[PDB]
């Protein structure tokens, strides 16, 4: 299951900080759809406070998500769906799109489609929460940088370079996965991310029928600083 290489890459990602933030905006016990959930690490933490449903385009990642849920006796439905065309049968009180998952969208249209889909799934008062890269992060940490590390089962080399569009990044990943015989299998992947100034996102949210409640930086209560790396949005369906 190749998907575990992602769990190792993020073993030190402080997911409980995202969960603590969701807890400030959505009352525990409510129903949440966590979209673009990957291997569901944050989704499973959310399941400890909310009735949660996870959605991602990757069957492989959702398989790991499910196995982890079953091994910890959590009930969490994971379904394969594209965030721009969400469709859930039961009502949800909030939608979460965490850890820059929204940034994998490639066009302005994709983002508007995602927001419209979110609005259709929520009723009056439902919340939409997401965090994204700031323009500053794109221009610094993803501006021709190299990242690499070793975990127990795999090692990776990650190059982060500007893409063709403004505020875009091309992540060139190479994983060396250890096999049963102690030798390594290489897997190369290319991921694309794109961001926008926060004001562009606020406009789209309003066009999609949301009231923007808060725009904050780096897990703090205040508006983003000019050197903020991650921007958090809280919006509510009108
Ligand atoms: Mg209202």
GROMACS .gro file of C-alpha atoms and ligand atoms in nm:
model
  239
    1UNK     CA    1   0.000   0.000   0.000
    2UNK     CA    2   0.205   0.289  -0.144
    3UNK     CA    3  -0.025   0.537   0.038
    4UNK     CA    4   0.165   0.481   0.371
    5UNK     CA    5   0.461   0.678   0.234
    6UNK     CA    6   0.237   0.985   0.278
    7UNK     CA    7   0.168   0.903   0.642
    8UNK     CA    8   0.540   0.884   0.708
    9UNK     CA    9   0.612   1.208   0.521
   10UNK     CA   10   0.360   1.374   0.760
   11UNK     CA   11   0.423   1.174   1.079
   12UNK     CA   12   0.530   1.503   1.250
   13UNK     CA   13   0.249   1.722   1.101
   14UNK     CA   14   0.061   1.859   1.406
   15UNK     CA   15  -0.290   1.766   1.291
   16UNK     CA   16  -0.435   1.824   1.636
   17UNK     CA   17  -0.376   2.198   1.579
   18UNK     CA   18  -0.616   2.190   1.281
   19UNK     CA   19  -0.866   1.994   1.489
   20UNK     CA   20  -0.839   2.241   1.778
   21UNK     CA   21  -0.927   2.515   1.524
   22UNK     CA   22  -1.229   2.327   1.386
   23UNK     CA   23  -1.345   2.285   1.752
   24UNK     CA   24  -1.348   2.668   1.784
   25UNK     CA   25  -1.584   2.702   1.488
   26UNK     CA   26  -1.810   2.394   1.484
   27UNK     CA   27  -1.984   2.260   1.796
   28UNK     CA   28  -1.878   1.910   1.886
   29UNK     CA   29  -2.136   1.647   1.797
   30UNK     CA   30  -2.219   1.809   1.464
   31UNK     CA   31  -2.195   1.639   1.124
   32UNK     CA   32  -1.891   1.719   0.913
   33UNK     CA   33  -1.776   1.627   0.564
   34UNK     CA   34  -1.393   1.639   0.552
   35UNK     CA   35  -1.305   1.668   0.190
   36UNK     CA   36  -0.973   1.599   0.021
   37UNK     CA   37  -0.897   1.399   0.330
   38UNK     CA   38  -0.611   1.189   0.184
   39UNK     CA   39  -0.522   0.907   0.422
   40UNK     CA   40  -0.771   1.052   0.680
   41UNK     CA   41  -0.529   1.124   0.962
   42UNK     CA   42  -0.714   1.451   1.049
   43UNK     CA   43  -1.050   1.290   0.967
   44UNK     CA   44  -0.998   1.024   1.235
   45UNK     CA   45  -0.911   1.293   1.495
   46UNK     CA   46  -1.224   1.483   1.393
   47UNK     CA   47  -1.427   1.160   1.433
   48UNK     CA   48  -1.347   1.182   1.804
   49UNK     CA   49  -1.562   1.499   1.826
   50UNK     CA   50  -1.800   1.493   1.532
   51UNK     CA   51  -2.005   1.259   1.311
   52UNK     CA   52  -1.758   1.268   1.017
   53UNK     CA   53  -1.758   1.158   0.658
   54UNK     CA   54  -1.436   1.168   0.456
   55UNK     CA   55  -1.406   1.222   0.081
   56UNK     CA   56  -1.103   1.207  -0.153
   57UNK     CA   57  -1.033   1.131  -0.522
   58UNK     CA   58  -0.777   0.858  -0.427
   59UNK     CA   59  -0.907   0.505  -0.368
   60UNK     CA   60  -0.565   0.402  -0.237
   61UNK     CA   61  -0.553   0.673   0.025
   62UNK     CA   62  -0.916   0.599   0.133
   63UNK     CA   63  -0.827   0.232   0.174
   64UNK     CA   64  -0.559   0.325   0.430
   65UNK     CA   65  -0.801   0.577   0.592
   66UNK     CA   66  -1.058   0.299   0.635
   67UNK     CA   67  -0.814   0.043   0.770
   68UNK     CA   68  -0.694   0.294   1.030
   69UNK     CA   69  -1.057   0.374   1.128
   70UNK     CA   70  -1.140   0.003   1.164
   71UNK     CA   71  -0.826  -0.068   1.370
   72UNK     CA   72  -0.922   0.208   1.618
   73UNK     CA   73  -1.291   0.123   1.628
   74UNK     CA   74  -1.399   0.454   1.473
   75UNK     CA   75  -1.703   0.484   1.246
   76UNK     CA   76  -1.614   0.698   0.951
   77UNK     CA   77  -1.754   0.665   0.601
   78UNK     CA   78  -1.491   0.735   0.335
   79UNK     CA   79  -1.617   0.783  -0.021
   80UNK     CA   80  -1.434   0.845  -0.351
   81UNK     CA   81  -1.550   1.180  -0.483
   82UNK     CA   82  -1.408   1.491  -0.645
   83UNK     CA   83  -1.443   1.808  -0.418
   84UNK     CA   84  -1.581   2.001  -0.710
   85UNK     CA   85  -1.877   1.770  -0.737
   86UNK     CA   86  -1.957   1.660  -0.384
   87UNK     CA   87  -2.273   1.470  -0.333
   88UNK     CA   88  -2.375   1.329   0.003
   89UNK     CA   89  -2.718   1.191   0.087
   90UNK     CA   90  -2.731   1.289   0.455
   91UNK     CA   91  -2.716   1.654   0.571
   92UNK     CA   92  -2.394   1.810   0.705
   93UNK     CA   93  -2.345   2.103   0.937
   94UNK     CA   94  -1.991   2.182   0.821
   95UNK     CA   95  -1.743   2.111   0.543
   96UNK     CA   96  -1.372   2.104   0.615
   97UNK     CA   97  -1.100   2.125   0.351
   98UNK     CA   98  -0.782   2.101   0.545
   99UNK     CA   99  -0.406   2.114   0.511
  100UNK     CA  100  -0.392   2.305   0.181
  101UNK     CA  101  -0.598   2.038   0.006
  102UNK     CA  102  -0.793   2.317  -0.167
  103UNK     CA  103  -0.469   2.428  -0.326
  104UNK     CA  104  -0.453   2.117  -0.548
  105UNK     CA  105  -0.728   2.271  -0.761
  106UNK     CA  106  -0.587   2.398  -1.086
  107UNK     CA  107  -0.820   2.669  -1.215
  108UNK     CA  108  -1.036   2.950  -1.089
  109UNK     CA  109  -1.338   2.755  -1.222
  110UNK     CA  110  -1.246   2.454  -1.010
  111UNK     CA  111  -1.251   2.666  -0.696
  112UNK     CA  112  -1.595   2.819  -0.787
  113UNK     CA  113  -1.726   2.467  -0.860
  114UNK     CA  114  -1.596   2.350  -0.523
  115UNK     CA  115  -1.760   2.638  -0.337
  116UNK     CA  116  -2.094   2.593  -0.519
  117UNK     CA  117  -2.085   2.222  -0.434
  118UNK     CA  118  -2.016   2.307  -0.068
  119UNK     CA  119  -2.307   2.554  -0.065
  120UNK     CA  120  -2.546   2.294  -0.207
  121UNK     CA  121  -2.454   2.044   0.066
  122UNK     CA  122  -2.492   2.285   0.360
  123UNK     CA  123  -2.812   2.445   0.483
  124UNK     CA  124  -2.854   2.787   0.648
  125UNK     CA  125  -2.586   2.831   0.914
  126UNK     CA  126  -2.362   2.550   0.787
  127UNK     CA  127  -1.994   2.632   0.788
  128UNK     CA  128  -1.716   2.594   0.535
  129UNK     CA  129  -1.364   2.584   0.678
  130UNK     CA  130  -1.040   2.562   0.482
  131UNK     CA  131  -0.674   2.662   0.508
  132UNK     CA  132  -0.448   2.751   0.216
  133UNK     CA  133  -0.099   2.863   0.134
  134UNK     CA  134  -0.036   3.235   0.140
  135UNK     CA  135   0.124   3.406  -0.161
  136UNK     CA  136   0.432   3.465   0.063
  137UNK     CA  137   0.481   3.088   0.119
  138UNK     CA  138   0.472   3.030  -0.254
  139UNK     CA  139   0.736   3.298  -0.303
  140UNK     CA  140   0.965   3.162  -0.024
  141UNK     CA  141   0.935   2.793   0.089
  142UNK     CA  142   0.825   2.671  -0.255
  143UNK     CA  143   1.064   2.895  -0.451
  144UNK     CA  144   1.327   2.643  -0.570
  145UNK     CA  145   1.370   2.451  -0.243
  146UNK     CA  146   1.472   2.093  -0.172
  147UNK     CA  147   1.329   1.881   0.109
  148UNK     CA  148   1.423   1.527   0.199
  149UNK     CA  149   1.402   1.284   0.481
  150UNK     CA  150   1.415   0.925   0.589
  151UNK     CA  151   1.136   0.740   0.772
  152UNK     CA  152   1.123   0.371   0.867
  153UNK     CA  153   0.975   0.232   0.541
  154UNK     CA  154   1.066   0.498   0.287
  155UNK     CA  155   1.276   0.807   0.207
  156UNK     CA  156   1.182   1.096  -0.024
  157UNK     CA  157   1.336   1.382  -0.215
  158UNK     CA  158   1.100   1.673  -0.276
  159UNK     CA  159   1.174   1.965  -0.505
  160UNK     CA  160   0.937   2.262  -0.480
  161UNK     CA  161   0.958   2.509  -0.768
  162UNK     CA  162   0.733   2.784  -0.909
  163UNK     CA  163   0.483   2.666  -1.172
  164UNK     CA  164   0.377   2.854  -1.486
  165UNK     CA  165   0.079   3.037  -1.338
  166UNK     CA  166   0.124   3.305  -1.071
  167UNK     CA  167   0.138   3.173  -0.714
  168UNK     CA  168   0.171   2.812  -0.835
  169UNK     CA  169   0.415   2.538  -0.735
  170UNK     CA  170   0.519   2.209  -0.896
  171UNK     CA  171   0.617   1.951  -0.631
  172UNK     CA  172   0.845   1.685  -0.781
  173UNK     CA  173   0.847   1.393  -0.544
  174UNK     CA  174   1.062   1.080  -0.551
  175UNK     CA  175   0.998   0.803  -0.293
  176UNK     CA  176   1.238   0.517  -0.226
  177UNK     CA  177   1.029   0.247  -0.066
  178UNK     CA  178   1.198  -0.043   0.110
  179UNK     CA  179   1.082  -0.387  -0.004
  180UNK     CA  180   1.062  -0.718   0.183
  181UNK     CA  181   1.419  -0.796   0.070
  182UNK     CA  182   1.572  -0.469   0.199
  183UNK     CA  183   1.620  -0.326  -0.149
  184UNK     CA  184   1.433  -0.018  -0.270
  185UNK     CA  185   1.160   0.059  -0.520
  186UNK     CA  186   1.143   0.408  -0.662
  187UNK     CA  187   0.821   0.599  -0.728
  188UNK     CA  188   0.820   0.948  -0.884
  189UNK     CA  189   0.514   1.178  -0.858
  190UNK     CA  190   0.435   1.534  -0.963
  191UNK     CA  191   0.184   1.742  -0.767
  192UNK     CA  192   0.055   2.084  -0.858
  193UNK     CA  193  -0.065   2.353  -0.622
  194UNK     CA  194  -0.192   2.701  -0.675
  195UNK     CA  195  -0.301   2.979  -0.447
  196UNK     CA  196  -0.450   3.327  -0.464
  197UNK     CA  197  -0.447   3.641  -0.249
  198UNK     CA  198  -0.701   3.596   0.035
  199UNK     CA  199  -0.922   3.867  -0.115
  200UNK     CA  200  -0.974   3.649  -0.426
  201UNK     CA  201  -1.097   3.363  -0.211
  202UNK     CA  202  -1.330   3.598  -0.011
  203UNK     CA  203  -1.485   3.715  -0.341
  204UNK     CA  204  -1.549   3.363  -0.460
  205UNK     CA  205  -1.695   3.266  -0.125
  206UNK     CA  206  -1.941   3.558  -0.144
  207UNK     CA  207  -2.025   3.470  -0.511
  208UNK     CA  208  -2.104   3.114  -0.383
  209UNK     CA  209  -2.349   3.245  -0.121
  210UNK     CA  210  -2.127   3.240   0.192
  211UNK     CA  211  -2.073   3.502   0.458
  212UNK     CA  212  -1.698   3.515   0.532
  213UNK     CA  213  -1.667   3.508   0.910
  214UNK     CA  214  -1.294   3.509   0.967
  215UNK     CA  215  -0.963   3.517   0.773
  216UNK     CA  216  -0.672   3.440   1.004
  217UNK     CA  217  -0.304   3.348   0.981
  218UNK     CA  218  -0.092   3.059   1.105
  219UNK     CA  219  -0.326   2.908   1.367
  220UNK     CA  220  -0.355   3.241   1.550
  221UNK     CA  221  -0.669   3.455   1.608
  222UNK     CA  222  -0.539   3.755   1.418
  223UNK     CA  223  -0.562   3.859   1.054
  224UNK     CA  224  -0.269   3.724   0.848
  225UNK     CA  225   0.066   3.908   0.869
  226UNK     CA  226   0.268   3.981   0.553
  227UNK     CA  227   0.497   3.686   0.634
  228UNK     CA  228   0.211   3.446   0.721
  229UNK     CA  229   0.250   3.102   0.565
  230UNK     CA  230  -0.100   2.949   0.604
  231UNK     CA  231  -0.432   3.135   0.580
  232UNK     CA  232  -0.745   3.001   0.750
  233UNK     CA  233  -1.097   3.085   0.632
  234UNK     CA  234  -1.425   3.037   0.812
  235UNK     CA  235  -1.740   3.098   0.607
  236UNK     CA  236  -2.108   3.039   0.672
  237UNK     CA  237  -2.388   2.958   0.431
  238UNK     CA  238  -2.636   3.245   0.403
  239LIG    MG1  239  -2.821   3.242   0.856
   0.00000   0.00000   0.00000
